[PDB]
Design a protein around this ligand. Sequence first.
Ligand SMILES: CS[C@H]1O[C@H](CS[C@H]2O[C@H](CO)[C@@H](O)[C@H](O)[C@@H]2O)[C@@H](O)[C@H](O)[C@@H]1O
Length: 333
Amino acid sequence: SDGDTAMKAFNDTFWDPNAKMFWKDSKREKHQDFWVEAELWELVMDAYQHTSDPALKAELKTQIDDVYDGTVAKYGQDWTNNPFNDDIMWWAMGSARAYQITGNPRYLEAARDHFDFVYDTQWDEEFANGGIWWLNSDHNTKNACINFPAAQAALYLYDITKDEHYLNAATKIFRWGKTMLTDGNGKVFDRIEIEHGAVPDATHYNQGTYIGSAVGLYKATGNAVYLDDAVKAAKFTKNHLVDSNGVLNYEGPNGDLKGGKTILMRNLAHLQKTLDETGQYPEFSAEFDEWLAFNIEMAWSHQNSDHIVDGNWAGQGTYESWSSAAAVQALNG
Ligand SMILES: CS[C@H]1O[C@H](CS[C@H]2O[C@H](CO)[C@@H](O)[C@H](O)[C@@H]2O)[C@@H](O)[C@H](O)[C@@H]1O
């Protein structure tokens, strides 16, 4: 029931049925940013997968289509005019997932066409020995927020198509990212800037997409090193991106980072499932599961009377859809 209650409340508060987009906040004066809307799209999909209520499930399935339609009405179907490669990839990944749920051809075409644009034209071997550029306008930085999502998108496309091209892409992207965008022990760096080098600033959403791509690669390849990779990044997160009580911390005021627990929780659930199922890392798995449950209970204990939880999970007017999404995500894992 809790995942259902959380998603229903989130939609009540933030879904605009007229524009078929989420509102950016409860003042209902601006719709959500393009990239973030893909992440809310995935939240709808996660609720769809999680729920056991057939009425709600059908409504959510329709909503999957409506989110795409509202975005296409405002932004078009061809996102390759957007200078942000990450923006394109977040939508390509969401589209791959929407295809898996609905079977609608438009989503497979969207996923494959946009993934190909970014991977085939924005990968470069010269600077930093590999990696995808953040932007398709200026080529000054290669970032975790494009590279790990690209590996994830490739893994979904591999699953759908069985075309080894996509598994090879995921493997290549992830190898580069582990080598150049992490410390080797689970701390994921934000980016590498040309003429500077690595910027070793870790954040929830980049831990998350690293963990999700590692878990996906473990499953696709049968190579246990990838599971180990995921575990080390989860451990880092649990010990180093938390407050003194172990609650995942608040990354405001940056608007993009504020809601990043949403992406983190989505991907921590993949690891949780794989550890639970396989029985690997049983000691860590038990600790991890207890810590996840603790975080979820603390976050929800801060819900307001409308069952909305602000993204500072350590505390208490206007609520924002990105920051409020993480608590909903956490109950739909
Ligand atoms: C719009 S994507 C763009 O910005 C985000 C956040 S910039 C923010 O966080 C970083 C990580 O802690 C710091 O390095 C930076 O100084 C700011 O405080 C970033 O994650 C993306 O890689 C990209 O730069």
